[PDB]
Amino acid sequence: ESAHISDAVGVVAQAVHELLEKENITDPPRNIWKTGPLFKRVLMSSKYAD
Amino acid sequence: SIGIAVILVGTSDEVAIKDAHEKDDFHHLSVVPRVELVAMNETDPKSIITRICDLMSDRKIQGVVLADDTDQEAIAQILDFISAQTLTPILGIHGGSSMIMADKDESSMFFQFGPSIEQQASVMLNIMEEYDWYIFSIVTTYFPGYQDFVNKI
Amino acid sequence: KIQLNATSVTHKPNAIQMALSVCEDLISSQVYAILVSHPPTPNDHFTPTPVSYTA
Numbered sequence: 120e121s122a123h124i125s126d127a128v129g130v131v132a133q134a135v136h137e138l139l140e141k142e143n144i145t146d147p148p149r150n151i152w153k154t155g156p157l158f159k160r161v162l163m164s165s166k167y168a169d
Numbered sequence: 170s171i172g173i174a175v176i177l178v179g180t181s182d183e184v185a186i187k188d189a190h191e192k193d194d195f196h197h198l199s200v201v202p203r204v205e206l207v208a209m210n211e212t213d214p215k216s217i218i219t220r221i222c223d224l225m226s227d228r229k230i231q232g233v234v235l236a237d238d239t240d241q242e243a244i245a246q247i248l249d250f251i252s253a254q255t256l257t258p259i260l261g262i263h264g265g266s267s268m269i270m271a272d273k274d275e276s277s278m279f280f281q282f283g284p285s286i287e288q289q290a291s292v293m294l295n296i297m298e299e300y301d302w303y304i305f306s307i308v309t310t311y312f313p314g315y316q317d318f319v320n321k322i
Numbered sequence: 323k324i325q326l327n328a329t330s331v332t333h334k335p336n337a338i339q340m341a342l343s344v345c346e347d348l349i350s351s352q353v354y355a356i357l358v359s360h361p362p363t364p365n366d367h368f369t370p371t372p373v374s375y376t377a
């Protein structure tokens with residue numbers, strides 16, 4: 120599980136930084152997330168090489 | 170003395186429903202069902218989870234009915250999980266609790282008021298039979314219930 | 323100036339209390355991602371399903 124979680128967290132960090140370059144960055148409150156499908160599709164196009 | 174839960178979210182004639190709640194003839198079987206009506210909002214699913222948790226913990230709910238006024242299929246989609254994970258069955262009659270999703274779980278006990286995809290296809294073909302229009306075409310998107318409709322037609 | 327705040331929870335033998343607790347806590351923290359990483363479950367069901375449906 121060590122290297123597995125390491126790779127998952129690296130992927131998450133790169134995807135979050137990639138998304139931070141975009142506009143209309145809302146946040147989940149405490150209605151649906153209007154960037155829900157947007158964020159999901161951003162994560163779907165997540166390609167990496169490391 | 171079964172416990173029945175009625176949950177209303179959105180504008181509705183709650184007083185009329187309560188007056189018409191005891192409009193059935195159930196005197197021929199010893200049931201004396203207990204019905205509690207409670208109003209709710211469309212804030213988030215977790216609020217619904219908390220409300221149903223409190224209702225079943227307090228009144229020992231053996232049946233849940235949800236009625237709303239939204240246009241989102243997610244209501245029944247998540248209600249399926251509760252119906253499968255709880256021995257108490259759940260029913261949907263109006264609003265967001267009416268659109269039929271792909272399918273229910275094997276352990277699911279949730280039912281809806283409406284026709285299937287194939288029955289709607291049959292009615293639509295009956296319409297095309299009524300007025301003699303025999304040339305047509307079909308286009309659809311990747312919603313899950315597309316293969317069923319195409320194969321039925 | 324982007325910051326990464328961490329939130330973790332442990333196991334409980336039940337699957338409704340775990341579900342509601344995780345949902346409410348990670349909703350209040352306003353997180354973006356959720357992970358499930360436990361192979362040796364004594365339960366043979368292997369169910370992260372409440373987490374998935376709630377999130």
Ligand SMILES: *[C@@H]1O[C@H](CO)[C@@H](O)[C@H](O)[C@H]1NC(C)=O
Pocket residue numbers: 327328329350351
């Ligand atoms: C991090 O999350 C914890 C637990 O939800 C919260 O108490 C704290 O305020 C958060 N801190 C930051 C910097 O967001």
